[PDB]
Here is the input.
Amino acid sequence: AKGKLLTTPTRLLKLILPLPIQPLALLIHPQQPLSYVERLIQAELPPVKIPNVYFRAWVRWSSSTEMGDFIRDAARGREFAIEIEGYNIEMRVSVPSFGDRTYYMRQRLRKMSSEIDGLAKIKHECDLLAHRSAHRLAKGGFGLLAGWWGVVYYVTFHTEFGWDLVEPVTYLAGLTTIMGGYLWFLYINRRQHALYEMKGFDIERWEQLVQDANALRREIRVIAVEYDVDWDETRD
Amino acid sequence: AKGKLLTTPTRLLKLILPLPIQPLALLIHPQQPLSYVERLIQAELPPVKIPNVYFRAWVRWSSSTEMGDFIRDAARGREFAIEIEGYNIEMRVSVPSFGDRTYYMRQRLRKMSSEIDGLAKIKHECDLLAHRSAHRLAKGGFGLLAGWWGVVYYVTFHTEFGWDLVEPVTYLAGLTTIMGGYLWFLYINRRQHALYEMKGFDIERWEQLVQDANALRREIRVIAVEYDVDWDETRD
Amino acid sequence: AKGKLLTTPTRLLKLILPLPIQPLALLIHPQQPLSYVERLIQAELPPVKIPNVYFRAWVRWSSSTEMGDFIRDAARGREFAIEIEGYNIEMRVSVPSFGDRTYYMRQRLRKMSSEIDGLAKIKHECDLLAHRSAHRLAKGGFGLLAGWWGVVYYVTFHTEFGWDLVEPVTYLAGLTTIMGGYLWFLYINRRQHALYEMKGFDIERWEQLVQDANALRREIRVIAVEYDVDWDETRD
Amino acid sequence: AKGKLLTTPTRLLKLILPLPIQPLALLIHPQQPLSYVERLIQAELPPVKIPNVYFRAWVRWSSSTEMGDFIRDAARGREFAIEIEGYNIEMRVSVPSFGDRTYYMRQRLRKMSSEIDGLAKIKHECDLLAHRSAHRLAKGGFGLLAGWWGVVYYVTFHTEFGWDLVEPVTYLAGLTTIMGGYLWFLYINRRQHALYEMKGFDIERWEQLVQDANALRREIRVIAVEYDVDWDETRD
Ligand SMILES: [Ca+2]
Here is the structure.
């Protein structure tokens, strides 16, 4: 008495019809027109000298509409139907809802997003580690700076040596600091990448997952514009 | 003895031809084959015992070719012909060039590009707004520098202290500047986001517009390769 | 009463089934419809007056569906069935999972990836070759710096000239260093290209391998979305 | 007596056959199999109870080969042929050569490359302009440096003033040079972009043309691998 329409992962639609007890089943690309379906069911139906077909939302549509708009309208109605010249019976067919279409896409999104959440925990933890290390180092450096400043002040202004004996000291100090920085540049040949490699985090995979998930979300919002809006991502 | 088709913006084709007051009007989807057009015309035409329709460019064409490919391969001559078996009439029909497709796409593209130009002008304005603040602060810095220069010149020549009391202080001063700058970075570890939130600007919408425009340009250029090349985006 | 098909690496399918010593073997391209398979089997089978073949998953399917879509929608059950009108035999046939397609693609992918790993190891070696040269030169620079430091220390404390003859010279010296470095840039306005030309390395080939590998990964992941997801590239 | 095969810009092939005086003409996607053509010509031919078809290079091929490999083989032969069960007609058909296929692609390449050559002339000329300007400036700077060095030497070592009156001079000089550099940074708020904008050169268009042309070259070399190699780009 009834038929069905179903969604596939490969953006094709799977029609099922109680056509002669033993139902027929078809695959339709959404950009195709309904005349494809009419021709194909004519091939599936018997002669009578060829039959005629009509698709209906109570209105009948033309045979040159793309499947997508027809389904938008039928989801507005929640079901559509078919009329044939000979059998004289209205074959009603159900239609997927929004979630009925976005099921596979949202499942992929949930898997990818849980993986990304784990990766984000990893990255955040090790980033804060490196953050604390660098800031402890900077605190020590500022301490050295303040010590040097107090030294030069209390020496030049409150010591019998004077600036005469102090300029060479601070010049040698500046050159030794440059030598230390140079030795450090060569000690390199930033630390976050080594923390990743030693911890197991990956970046190319990370951005790959993120990019795929963003394209997914954009397709979701596209269909949510076409279909009913307000799909509550946090609810999924 | 002549007709023509027309390009709607809905990826359909509105064929208009004389079918011997209101001439024969037909809606077509491009993926349809010519056999469906044949049956459609047969439905529109009177009896004879049904005639067989031929399409031509001469050459005789089949009945399974999609419309789009036939039109592409026809546009080198600007017209294609029909031969009905019954009426013995010569009929020719106009091929749409790149111009009509270009029209109903470029209109969307120009709307999008003008909107994007406005949005980018707004973003440019607010960028200038923050930039001039930073510029004024750097002007103040230049003023401080020149003040320090004049100070040390005065204390050198127009003073009895002499260079002996000058070199130490300024050195300490220089160190303090570094210290100050150092502290600044140490205080860091974002702002224009808030300036746009207060301005009421949309970045996701902007980027979506840009990417849609680029994709539509690519579609236009593809179909321009299908037809003759050199559609001259900058000119039109 | 059972058969199976197989996946060659040429985007064909080798069907093998019992057609009542050498069972019925058939080559298929996926874009073909099931009607061609029906006529092919009819040619292979004996007379009766020709029978009509049905395909099933229950559901009865049409005769225009491409093979690939039918297989995709069949793989949820791992088998699909045939019903011949004459013989009254029940026949079932095995659906290939993701594994066979994955096999004849992943083999190419692993070959490419291993070759790329070797090439990248070579490039890494030669990069290290130049890097160590630069490193040794910087070590020489460190030595010069420490020599200058010890020189000025000696002339300061272990010398009667005193700081008065020290500060000017070193200042000039520092300037000359800048001048030297300045001249170096002025002499500039490329080298590893020659090192690879002498090594005999191929960069265009390398990049082509990389891009082909990435595109083939994307194809695999697409067809993995078509079937069940999570093919785990890093694992296998 | 003879037929033809022709190339389209949209990677589809245009078959033309002397089939019933009034030739037939078909469009074939290269990845399709020859069984598509067999089915379609069966539909174009009369009954006899359906005819059979054979494609031949002297060998006959299967009806499940993709069109590309068949054409590779026929270009090895420079022509192929068709046989039918009832007509007993050896319908020989010609095949495009390498250039016969790459004609449109190479024409696009020539246009794009001439445009790019003009753009490259522009860029090279204005780049050399900026180059000369910057190097004249650097020569002047080096001259100032040498003047300063000679000044400080002949003053501190051959003038009655001495270092006592000179250190303040060069300190003030360094601060004034920093002030001048600071004023220069603010005079900005590199020159090649302004030269482009005032001259008319464009970059996004430039890289767009280059990217499209390189992808084109890759497709050309792909088909040159499939077909005969050594196509002599400089000859085109
Ligand atoms: Ca001094």
The beta strands of chain C are 3-7, 13-17, 24-28, 53-56, 79-84, 90-94. Chain C touches chain D through 21 residues (CB under 8 Å). Chain C has two domains: 3-96, 108-226. Chain C has six helices and six strands.
